[PDB]
Chain A
Amino acid sequence: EDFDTRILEVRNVFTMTAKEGRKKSIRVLVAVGNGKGAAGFSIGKATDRMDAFRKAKNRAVHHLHYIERYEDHTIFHDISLRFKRTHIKMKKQPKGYGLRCHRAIITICRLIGIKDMYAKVSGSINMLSLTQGLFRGLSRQETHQQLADKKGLHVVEIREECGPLPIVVASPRGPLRKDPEPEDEVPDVKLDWEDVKTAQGMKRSVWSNLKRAAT
Chain B
Amino acid sequence: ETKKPTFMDEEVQSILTKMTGLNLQKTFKPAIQELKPPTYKLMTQAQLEEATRQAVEAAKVRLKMPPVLEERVPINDVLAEDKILEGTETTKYVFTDISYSIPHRERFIVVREPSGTLRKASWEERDRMIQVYFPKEGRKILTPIIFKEENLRTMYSQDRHVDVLNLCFAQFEPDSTEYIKVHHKTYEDIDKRGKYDLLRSTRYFGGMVWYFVNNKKIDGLLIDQIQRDLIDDATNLVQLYHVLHPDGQSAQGAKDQAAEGINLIKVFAKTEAQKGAYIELTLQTYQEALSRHSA
- A-side residues, CB < 8 A to B, are 91-97, 144, 147, 151, 153-166, 168-169, 176-181
Which B residues touch A157, using CB under 8 A? 38-40
> Quick check: A155 and B42 within 8 Å, CB to CB?
yes
- Looking at the complex, which one of A95, A154, A161, A179 makes contact with B31 (CB distance below 8 Å)? A161
Which A residues touch B62, using CB under 8 A? 163
> A159 and B30 in contact (CB under 8 A), knowing A154-B48, A164-B55, A166-B48?
yes
Smallest CB-CB separation from A179: which chain B residue?
B44
> Quick check: B55 and A165 within 8 Å, CB to CB?
yes
> A169 and B43 in contact (CB under 8 A), knowing A162-B28, A164-B55?
no
> A163 and B28 in contact (CB under 8 A), knowing A93-B37, A94-B37, A158-B38?
yes
Known pairs A155-B41, A163-B62, A165-B55. 6 more at Cβ < 8 A?
A94-B36, A154-B47, A157-B38, A159-B30, A165-B28, A176-B44
> Quick check: A164 and B44 within 8 Å, CB to CB?
no
Q: In the complex, how many angstroms separate the beta carbon of B39 from the nearest chain A beta carbon?
A: 5
Q: In the complex, how many angstroms separate the beta carbon of B204 from the nearest chain A beta carbon?
A: 18
Which A residues touch B29, using CB under 8 A? 162
The DSSP consensus for interface residues of chain A is loop
Smallest CB-CB separation from B58: which chain A residue?
A164
Q: Nearest 7 A-B pairs (CB), nearest first? A: A94-B35, A165-B28, A153-B42, A166-B51, A154-B43, A164-B58, A161-B31
> Quick check: B42 and A154 within 8 Å, CB to CB?
yes
> Quick check: B37 and A178 within 8 Å, CB to CB?
no
> Quick check: A164 and B28 within 8 Å, CB to CB?
yes
Q: Which of B32-74 contact A (CB under 8 A)?
A: 33, 35-48, 51-52, 54-55, 58, 62
Q: Does B24 contact A (CB under 8 A)?
A: yes
> Quick check: B55 and A166 within 8 Å, CB to CB?
yes
Chain B residue total in the interface (Cβ 8 A): 27
Q: In the complex, how many angstroms separate the beta carbon of A76 from the nearest chain B beta carbon?
A: 10
Which A residues touch B30, using CB under 8 A? 159, 161-162
Complex CA gap A151/B47 in Å reads 15
Most chain B beta-carbon contacts within 10 A, residue among A144, A156, A177, A178: A156
The contact sample of 7 A-B pairs, CB cut-off 8 A, is A97-B35, A154-B44, A154-B48, A157-B38, A157-B40, A164-B55, A166-B43
- Looking at the complex, which one of B28, B31, B40 makes contact with A169 (CB distance below 8 Å)? B40
> Quick check: B37 and A180 within 8 Å, CB to CB?
no
Q: In the complex, how many angstroms separate the beta carbon of B202 from the nearest chain A beta carbon?
A: 15
Complex CA gap A33/B36 in Å reads 28
Complex CA gap A163/B28 in Å reads 6
> Quick check: B24 and A165 within 8 Å, CB to CB?
yes
- Looking at the complex, which one of B25, B36, B48, B58 makes contact with A156 (CB distance below 8 Å)? B48
Smallest CB-CB separation from A118: which chain B residue?
B37
Which B residues touch A151, using CB under 8 A? 42
Which A residues touch B37, using CB under 8 A? 91-94
Q: In the complex, how many angstroms separate the beta carbon of B103 from the nearest chain A beta carbon?
A: 30
> Quick check: A163 and B40 within 8 Å, CB to CB?
no
Q: In the complex, how many angstroms separate the beta carbon of B62 from the nearest chain A beta carbon?
A: 8
- Looking at the complex, which one of A154, A155, A163, A180 makes contact with B58 (CB distance below 8 Å)? A163
> Quick check: B40 and A155 within 8 Å, CB to CB?
yes
Which A residues touch B38, using CB under 8 A? 94, 157-160
Which B residues touch A96, using CB under 8 A? 35
> Quick check: A158 and B40 within 8 Å, CB to CB?
yes
- Looking at the complex, which one of A95, A177, A178 makes contact with B35 (CB distance below 8 Å)? A95
Smallest CB-CB separation from A77: which chain B residue?
B40
Which A residues touch B25, using CB under 8 A? 165
> Quick check: B44 and A178 within 8 Å, CB to CB?
yes
Q: In the complex, how many angstroms separate the beta carbon of B25 from the nearest chain A beta carbon?
A: 8
Smallest CB-CB separation from B51: which chain A residue?
A166
Which B residues touch A168, using CB under 8 A? 48
> Quick check: A161 and B33 within 8 Å, CB to CB?
yes
B18-31 vs A, Cβ < 8 Å mask (1 yes, 0 no):
00000011001111
Q: In the complex, how many angstroms separate the beta carbon of B31 from the nearest chain A beta carbon?
A: 5
Most chain B beta-carbon contacts within 10 A, residue among A151, A158, A160: A160
Which B residues touch A177, using CB under 8 A? 44
Q: Which of B185-237 contact A (CB under 8 A)?
A: none
Smallest CB-CB separation from B41: which chain A residue?
A156
> Quick check: A153 and B40 within 8 Å, CB to CB?
no
> Quick check: B36 and A176 within 8 Å, CB to CB?
no
> Quick check: A153 and B44 within 8 Å, CB to CB?
yes
Complex CA gap A187/B33 in Å reads 31
